[model samples]
Target chain A: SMEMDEKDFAADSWSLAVDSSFLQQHKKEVMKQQDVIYELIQTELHHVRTLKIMTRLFRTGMLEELHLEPGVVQGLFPCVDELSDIHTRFLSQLLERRRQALCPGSTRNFVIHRLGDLLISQFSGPSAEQMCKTYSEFCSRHSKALKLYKELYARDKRFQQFIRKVTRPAVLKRHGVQECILLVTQRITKYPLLISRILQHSHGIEEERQDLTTALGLVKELLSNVDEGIYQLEKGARLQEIYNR
Target chain B: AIRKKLVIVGDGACGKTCLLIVFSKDQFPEVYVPTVFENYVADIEVDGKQVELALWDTAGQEDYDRLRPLSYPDTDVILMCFSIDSPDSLENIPEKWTPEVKHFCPNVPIILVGNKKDLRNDEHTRRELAKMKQEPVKPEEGRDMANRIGAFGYMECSAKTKDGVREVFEMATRAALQA
Candidate 1:
C-alpha cells in the first residue's frame, strides 16, 4: 500500500506541472504547450493518472481499479501509445528536441524513455509477456472504473467541463518531433486563470461532489503520467540517439 | 492516352518548388526553401485534351544550369523561372544556360516566370536600377534576361503565398496545348 501523504494531493491545482523540469520558466504564450498537455490529460487520464486517482478515491483499497483501467489495457496489450510506453517516449524525444537539451540517467530521462519504449517497440508480456499482460488486464479494469467515473461526473458541473475540454481534442499529429503536442501541452497549464475566473462567478451543479473530486484528481494524474511517462520514454530515446552517433 | 511532360527550370530561389507545390496540392507551404530535386505532375483534361502534365523541378544551381541538357533524356515543356528581384539569375537563361537546353531539345515548348511580385517595392527599385545601369549588380535584375532567351512569355508570382503560383501552371498547360 502506498502511503498517502497529503502533500502529494495538494489543494492547489497546479503544483504538479510547476514541479516539472521540462516545463520550467521559459513557457510560451502563443504555442501554450503546458496548457495543451493539461487539456489532453483533462480529456482522459491514462493508467498512471487513473491509478493515482484511484489511490485518491479508494485510499488503501486502490489495488483493484489500477489492475483494470482501459488505458492500461491499451497501454500494454491493445497497441496504442497513449495507453502504452512507446508513444509516450517517442513524444518525449521530440519534446527534448524542442527543449534543446538532453540529460541522461536523470529521473526526467527515465520518464521520457518509459513513454518512448511504449511507442517504438512491440509489446512483449512479462514472463513471456506476463509483465505486459498483467499491466494490460489492470488497465482494462481501470477503463471500466473510468466509465463509472464519467457517469459519476454527469451531475457535476466543473468536473465535467474540465474532462470535456481536456479529452475532446484528441488530435493525433505524428510530426517527427512533437512540437505541436508540446505546444498544446504548454497551452494546458496556462488556462488556470480561465478556470479560476469561471469558478469564481459560475453557479450550477454539484461540482464539489466527492465523485467529481475523484474526476479532477484523474485529470491531474493523467497530466502527471504524461509528464512522467514522456520523460521515461524520452530519456531512453535521447540516450539511444546519442549512442548511435 | 498520353500525358504531356513539362520540365520547370530556373535559377535558385526563383520559386519553382513553390509553384509546383501550389499547382499540385492547391495549397502552399508557409516556408519553402529551394529543393535539391523535386517536381509535380497533374492530370489536366483541358478543353477535350486528355493531357497529363508532368512538371519537373531541377536544382537551382548555376553549375547545373543547362535547362534541357541538365533535364536531358526526357523533354517536353520547359518552364524557365526568373526573378523580377534577380536580374542575373534571369540573365543566366541566355548568357549561361537555357540556350544550351534549347539547342538540345529544340522542339520543346518554353514558358518563363518572373516570381516574387509581392515584393514589388524592393523589386521595382532593382528593376529600375538595372534598366538605367544596363547591367544591374543585384541577383534580381534578371527579367530582361528572360526576354533575351526567346521565352514564350513572361509572368510574375509570389510562390510563398500562392499568389500567381497556379496561374503559372495554367499558363504552361495552355502553351503545351498550342504546341
Candidate 2:
C-alpha cells in the first residue's frame, strides 16, 4: 500500500544526484519534457468535464426538451459518468503528488515519484483499456445521434435554442451534439501521441521509462481497438442506409 | 408468366422502403433486406397477366447517391415516392429525384406515388403541417406532379391501413405490361 503524506515536498528533492550521470546532467531537459505529462492531466480533466456535462444534460430532461426520441437517446448514452469517475480519481492522485512534492527537504521528483506506479498500473492497464471500450460504444451510435439532432432541429424550437446555446463557444463549435461525440472517440488517440513523446525524454530513468513505454503500448492497442469498432460501425451504417431508404 | 422489376426511390422514411417492404412481405417488413436465395416474391395475376414482382430498394440519402443508380439497370418501372405528411419530400421530386431517375432510366416509365395517405386528414398531422404553412399533399397535386414528371400514372396509398395498397401494384403491373 502507498503512504499518503500531507505535506508538500521540495522541488530540489527531484534530482538524480546518486543515479545515472546522464540523468543528473540532463535533469532540466527531463523536467521540461515531463511537465507535458502534467499538462495532459489538465487536458484529461477538461475532457472529463465535457463528458460529465454532456451526460448530465441527457439525464436532466434536456434530451426530452429537444424532442429527441427515447430509442435514439438510448444507444448514445455515453460512458460519461463511468469515464468521469475514473479520470477524476486519477487526476486527484496526480494533483496530490504534485502538491506533496513541493514539501521542503523532499528528494524525489514528485511528478514521477507519485505517478511512477500509478501510471503503469492504471494508465497502461484498465484505465487506458476502458477508454477504447467506452469510445467504441459511443461511436457505433454516432449516426443515430446526428439524425436525432437533425430531426429536432427541424421540428423543435426549444431544441434549436438549446443547440445554439451549447454550440456557441469556439471550442464547442466543432464538438456540437454530433461533433462532441466524435471528439471523445478521437480523444483516446491522443494518449499515445502524448505518451510516446514523453517516453523519449523519460530515458535514463528505468522505472519512469518502463511506465511510459507500457503506457504507450497500451494506448496504441486502444487505438487499434477503436479503429476496428469504427470499421464495424461504418459497415453497419451503410446497410442501415439501404434499409432506411 | 412475366417478370416485372420495380425500383422505388425518394427521401428517407418517406414510405419508399415500407412500400417495397409491404409489397415484399404487404407494404414493408418491420426488419431489413433479403439475400440472393432469400428474398420476397409476390405472385399476382392482374388483367389476366401472371406477373412475378421483384422489388429493388434504394437509399434516398445523398450518401448513397453513387450507389442508387446501380439498381436502375433493368428496371421495368420506378415508383418515385414522397410522404403525404411531408410536403418537402414531394418538392424534391421535380428538383432532386426526377433528374436522377431520368438520367439513369431514360426510356423506363416513372410512377409518382403519395405514401402515408392515411395521415393526409389526421387532425394532428394537419395541424402540424398547418404550423409549417403546409398541409398533406392532395390528390390533385399528386396528379399534377405525375403529369409534370411524365409519369405513366399517379396513385396514393396508406401502408399502415392497407388502403389502396393493391391498386398501386396493379397499376404498376399494368404499366409494365404496356411497356
Candidate 3:
C-alpha cells in the first residue's frame, strides 16, 4: 500500500499536515520527533556529500594523478556511483517533506498524520530499508577497499601523498573511505532505534504506530543483515593478508 | 553508392581524434591520444542518400609535416579542426593547415571545424583561459576563418556531449556529394 504512491508522489507536491488535536496535545513530543527526523535527514545528506566526493575522485581521472592503475582503483568501490543515486533519491524525498510544509493549505493534522504516515511507510519499506540493504552490500566490499588503499600506499608514492593530502582535513580525517563505510553501516542501523523512539511517543495514533512498528522491524532486520555482511568481508580480508605473506 | 573521402588536419590535441571517433564510433574518448593517420568508415544516410564516408585522421606535429599531404589527395572534403578551448589551435588554422590543404587539394571543399564546443561555456575551461587573458574561439572567429580560407562551411561540435557531432559529418558529406 505504501509503495503504490511512490511514483505518483515523486513529482507532485502537497502539504504534509492536516489540522488535528493530536499535534496540539503532543506538541512537545512531536517537536522532539521532528528534531530527530531532521537529524536523520541531515545525516543522510552528509552521506550523499561524502559518496559524491568519493566517486568523483575516480571519475575525474584523479587516479591518473596518483599514477595508479585505473583498474586497481576501480576494484575498491563496487556500485559506489549507484549508491550515490540511491542516497540522492532518498535525500530528495526527505527534503520534499520540508517543502510540502510551505505549500498551500498545510495544517497541524496533516503534519502529524500525513507526514508521519509517509515517513513510517517510506522508512519501513523503501528508503531507510533500502539504505540498510545497500550499505550491507557496500560494507561487504570494505575489505577490498582497504586492501586497495594499503597496496597503493605501500607501492605508489603519489598515492601515498594523495591519501595524506586528502585526509589532513579534520572532517575528512574522520570520514575517510574506510571510516565512511563504517559510518554508513552505523547510520543504517540507527534508523530502527530512532523510528522506534518516534513511534513509542506516537501513541493514540493507531495508524502511525503500526506503520512505525513495521518500519522498526524492517530497520532492525536491516541492521543484522549488514552486521553479517561485515563479518564475511573481514574473513575475506584475513585471507588476502595471509596470501600477501 | 555515394562515396566521400574526408581528411581532417589540425594541431595535436585540438580534438581531431575526438571528433572523428564520436562521429564514426558513437563513443566519446576520455583520454587524449595523439593521432597519426588513423582511418575510420561511417556509412550514413543523409537526405535520402546512402553515403559511404571515409575519415582520414592526420598527425599535426611537425614531425609528420612531410607525410600528412599523402592523405590529402583524392579527398572530397577537408575538415580543418581546431579546439574551441584552444585559441592557439584556431590561430593555426590559416597560418598552418590552410596552406597545406590548399597546396595539395586546391579544389577540395574544406569545412572549418571548431571542436570541443562544450568547453566554450565550461567553467573550468573558462577559468584556465582567463588566467592567460584568453577565451575560447568564438563562432564568428571560426566563420571568418572559413570565409578567408574559402572553405565550404564552418561548424562547431563537442564530442563529449555528442552535440553537433553528427551535423558536422552530415555537412561534410553534403559538401563531398556536391563535389
Measured by TM-score, the strongest candidate is 2
TM-score of 2: 0.45
Off by over 4 Å in 2: A1-27, A57-67, A75-77, A104-116, A124-129, A166-175, A231-245, B1-179
TM-score (0 to 1) for chain B of model 2 = 0.89
- Count of steric clashes across candidates, in order: 82, 16, 7
Stretches off by above 4 angstroms in model 3 are A1-26, A58-61, A103-133, A169-171, A227-245, B1-179
Minimum summed lDDT over a 10-residue window in model 2 chain A is located at A5-14
Query: Which tens-of-lDDT digit does each residue in B47-114 have in candidate 1?
Result: 56676576655542233221113343346667887665555666567755576668766877777777
lDDT values for all models: 0.43, 0.63, 0.64
Ranking by lDDT: 3, 2, 1
Alpha carbon lDDT at A84, candidate 3: 86
Of the pair 1 and 2, which is ahead by lDDT? 2
Candidate 2 per-residue lDDT, tens place, A30-91, comes to 65554555545545555665666567654344755655555555545445667667776776
Candidate 3 clash pair list: A16-A110, A17-A110, A17-A111, A18-A109, A18-A110, A18-A111, A19-A109
In the range B59-82, model 2's lDDT, one tens digit per residue, is 422333432343565578888889
**Top candidate by lDDT:** 3
Error of model 1, residue A130, in angstroms: 47
lDDT of 3 at A222: 56
- How close is chain B to the truth by TM-score, in each candidate? 0.74, 0.89, 0.91
Instruction: State the lDDT of candidate 3 residue by residue for A120-156, as single tens digits.
Output: 5555556665665666667656656666666767887
Arrange candidates, best TM-score first. 2, 3, 1
